[PDB]
Subunit: 204 residues, 2 copies
Amino acid sequence: DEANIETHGMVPMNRLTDDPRWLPAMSERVTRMVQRDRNHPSVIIWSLGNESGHGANHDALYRWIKSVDPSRPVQYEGGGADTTATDIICPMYARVDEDQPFPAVPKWSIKKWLSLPGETRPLILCEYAHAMGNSLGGFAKYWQAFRQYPRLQGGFVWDWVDQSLIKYDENGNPWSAYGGDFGDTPNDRQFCMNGLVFADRTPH
Amino acid sequence: SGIFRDVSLLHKPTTQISDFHVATRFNDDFSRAVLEAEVQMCGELRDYLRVTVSLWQGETQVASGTAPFGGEIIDERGGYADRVTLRLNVENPKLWSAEIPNLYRAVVELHTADGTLIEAEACDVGFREVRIENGLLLLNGKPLLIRGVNRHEHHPLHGQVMDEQTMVQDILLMKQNNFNAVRCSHYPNHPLWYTLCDRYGLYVVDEANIETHGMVPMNRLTDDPRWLPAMSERVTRMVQRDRNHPSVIIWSLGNESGHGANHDALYRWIKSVDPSRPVQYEGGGADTTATDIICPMYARVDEDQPFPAVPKWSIKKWLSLPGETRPLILCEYAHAMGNSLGGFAKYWQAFRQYPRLQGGFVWDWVDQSLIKYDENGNPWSAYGGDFGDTPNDRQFCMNGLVFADRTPH
């Protein structure tokens, strides 16, 4: 279950979340969420949101949860995926064997990530294996790691369905639209179609 | 078998220096060190005896301290009358390392209050700090990358007898080939070896003369208290002899003697008498309570070998096992028997990518082959079985990176 907080478009990503002024507003996002779903045996992990970098407000909110609901772990990827605001290491798109060394927010090979000095948490990918168009190449490299490393416990493929819409030709013939097909500017074209299945729920 | 090492006569004064330990402490940056020497005596104690300790830098004297016998109160009964600890301050010491084996000379003089010398002892000293912090084996503050090799004392004509020349040849070679460290497989070495590593610059691993491979299970003797006494002697006298060598940076409990309780006693002993170096043992699984380092032998880069009881996990896997925090340094890898060393690049590549993979020791330096003849007393390399010896493991005594004559494979 995940809080409705995403601030990807900011610079840095951490701009509103490291701001005390926004604390109350984020607060509501996490609290009302916890307040509403806490009795669901299916909910097993809580997430502070997505792509918001890492701010103090995350830290507080993590804590809040930990005290009100100690029956679930809490996870959050922002700020490098292994911050003090998460219980599970949960990178998005890290490679099985290849290190992606971004500055400040590197994405180590997942096997090496567990072994970093001091690290002891488990690793579950929050997003891996982008199924955009003709994809899933490598999948198996992953499922093998998951099986050989006790502390690599899975992940969540990105994602279920394509975010396509239905349009119509002059004959009123139906047809799947995408980024910009509405005059929507600016857009990100076909990037909304990353599903393992067509919007109709027909499989790739 | 036989009398393979030197034989000497030493003449000492009745009242003498009987032992002495050296130590070095630094501040957060190695800008200041404190050398701490503890000296012990034997013979008639007198109020006029003193001990002088001077530390030299070639022809230069850097620090000196004099004192009289008798130290701190350690227990309800007092302290040692026949001991003393001096403490010399050293500013901006030159650190010792395999890259730069900077050495100092310490002179320990026993004399009379009037200044009359009774006897002198001494040793090269090198300032370093070997420590394990946060999962890493550090040296003078930096995480080492061990480029080493295991090496026995072998000589084609001489047998087990060592000599400078051989010792030096081996040294120059390992260095020319970019080796950093060496492991004394699987026993303490010829005294001078340590001195040579101190000056040339090489990381040593002092190993105790204990291997009980042929036992079934391997445990048999080392888990038997009746054997504790006999094993203890091999650990303790070892540490008592080589402990002041800057080059020794790790102690090892010996080899392939499974995992017994004696092993734990022994690991604790060292940990107590010499908190300065880490301790390793590989037996019983390589990641036992008797070792400060995960030190497997022949564990693969990415493939597990799950033997029952003593599996060899893939080295990348081992690090992350649930709860595992130790650094990993292979005590034996890349078995160079004959036409071998295939897949080497694979380790090095892991070594350089995982912070906690810090090296290993190739097995091994030289071929244990002997020389033989025939007609014209013309020599020829001999192996297992070649002497009528039964049983034997034939060529399995040949696994070095160099031929017994020090020519390269």
